[PDB]
Amino acid sequence: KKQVGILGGTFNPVHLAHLVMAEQAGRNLGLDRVFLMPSYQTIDAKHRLNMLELAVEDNPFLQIETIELARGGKSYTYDTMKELTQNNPDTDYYFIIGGDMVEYLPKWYKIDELTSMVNFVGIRRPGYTTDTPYPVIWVDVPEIDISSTKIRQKIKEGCSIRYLVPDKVIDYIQNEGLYEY
Amino acid sequence: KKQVGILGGTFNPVHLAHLVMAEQAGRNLGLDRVFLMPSYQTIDAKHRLNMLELAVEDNPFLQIETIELARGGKSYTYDTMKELTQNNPDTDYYFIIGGDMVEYLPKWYKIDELTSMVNFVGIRRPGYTTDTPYPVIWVDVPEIDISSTKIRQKIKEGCSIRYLVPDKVIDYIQNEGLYEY
Numbered sequence: 001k002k003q004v005g006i007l008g009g010t011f012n013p014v015h016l017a018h019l020v021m022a023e024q025a026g027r028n029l030g031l032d033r034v035f036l037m038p039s040y041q042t043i044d045a046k047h048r049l050n051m052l053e054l055a056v057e058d059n060p061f062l063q064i065e066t067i068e069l070a071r072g073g074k075s076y077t078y079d080t081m082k083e084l085t086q087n088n089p090d091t092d093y094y095f096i097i098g099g100d101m102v103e104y105l106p107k108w109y110k111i112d113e114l115t116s117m118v119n120f121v122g123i124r125r126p127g128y129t130t131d132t133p134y135p136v137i138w139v140d141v142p143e144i145d146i147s148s149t150k151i152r153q154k155i156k157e158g159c160s161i162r163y164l165v166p167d168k169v170i171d172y173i174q175n176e177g178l179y180e181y
Numbered sequence: 182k183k184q185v186g187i188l189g190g191t192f193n194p195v196h197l198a199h200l201v202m203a204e205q206a207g208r209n210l211g212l213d214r215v216f217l218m219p220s221y222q223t224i225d226a227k228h229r230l231n232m233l234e235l236a237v238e239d240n241p242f243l244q245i246e247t248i249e250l251a252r253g254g255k256s257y258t259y260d261t262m263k264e265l266t267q268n269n270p271d272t273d274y275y276f277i278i279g280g281d282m283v284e285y286l287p288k289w290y291k292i293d294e295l296t297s298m299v300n301f302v303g304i305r306r307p308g309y310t311t312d313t314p315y316p317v318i319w320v321d322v323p324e325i326d327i328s329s330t331k332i333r334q335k336i337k338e339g340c341s342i343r344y345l346v347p348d349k350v351i352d353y354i355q356n357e358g359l360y361e362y
């Protein structure tokens with residue numbers, strides 16, 4: 001009986017806050033490992049995946065779940081977790097979301113069933129409340145106020161992203177000429 | 182005429198927020214480089230300095246200013262900047278502080294003279310105001326809610342510090358058996 005975390009996102013590009021959130025939530029709960037799960041869709045997914053793999057490269061605790069990139073199309077989270085739980089029927093999944101996202105959990109397709117499928121884990125964040133419907137358990141993570149949009153904006157404006165983004169990922173962005181449009 | 186940033190702290194231990202604050206403040210202002218300036222004083226300074234040098238190792242933009250470790254004793258910031266400006270009379274110093282510290286600027290010894298010596302740079306932070314006496318100019322930095330005390334507490338409790346602290350610094354802490362008391 002495995003316990004596995006999932007951190008979803010576009011990861012466009014992956015950055016330090018993704019790594020801290022995944023490692024801290026998983027390690028604090030004592031999960032076996034945490035997967036960063038890129039969503040489908042504008043740069044090609046191969047790039048997002050290469051950067052993701054570079055970012056988690058040296059750390060067996062963090063891995064990449066690619067099922068959403070392969071299946072494409074609709075991708076409601078319920079459908080994804082339904083495939084993952086059928087593939088891994090003895091795995092307890094811990095679906096990690098930022099405290100800010102916990103509010104929109106009603107907008108989630110078949111959130112009813114989804115909460116019976118997986119364990120939602122909220123990341124306590126300043127400003128947003130620790131209250132919600134649905135069974136969410138919470139974990140404390142140092143606030144890291146970085147977002148992929150912020151990074152892309154900094155790249156577009158020609159500002160530094162060092163330490164906000166892993167060195168191997170910065171090198172890839174520059175080698176492939178990403179985000180400078 | 183050089184423009185040089187200074188980021189003071191105990192750095193006990195150095196961590197990701199120190200590196201982001203220093204790099205972002207310096208790069209956003211277009212400074213020539215930024216020095217992390219460890220204060221005097223309980224682990225020996227050699228350790229704090231070794232970790233600092235490991236942390237900035239691969240980045241010519243960030244350096245370590247050791248004058249406070251060498252002079253010891255009182256160490257009012259005014260005295261330190263007085264020595265540094267006499268040593269480097271054509272350098273304009275930019276003294277970087279967190280937005281939270283800008284409030285206590287009156288508690289600073291000879292803050293009057295100190296503001297004529299250097300340029301204070303405040304780091305805009307959530308919660309704390311962008312108002313103050315004294316001539317402070319401000320720079321935006323992604324909020325990174327890490328502190329040396331937090332890290333030490335995590336080490337003492339046996340929690341993960343990966344990504345919160347550079348890999349070379351984690352290795353040193355573990356190699357020297359620091360902070361696990």
Ligand SMILES: Nc1ncnc2[nH]cnc12
Nearest residue numbers: 009010011012146147148
């Ligand atoms: N929801 C998200 N997906 C991918 N990257 C992010 N960075 C910040 N938020 C993100």
Ligand SMILES: Nc1ncnc2[nH]cnc12
Nearest residue numbers: 190191192193327328329
């Ligand atoms: N004032 C400070 N000095 C050294 N390390 C810190 N980490 C957070 N705040 C610090």
Ligand SMILES: [Mg+2]
Nearest residue numbers: 088089090091
């Ligand atoms: Mg299984």
Ligand SMILES: [Mg+2]
Nearest residue numbers: 269270271272
């Ligand atoms: Mg000079």
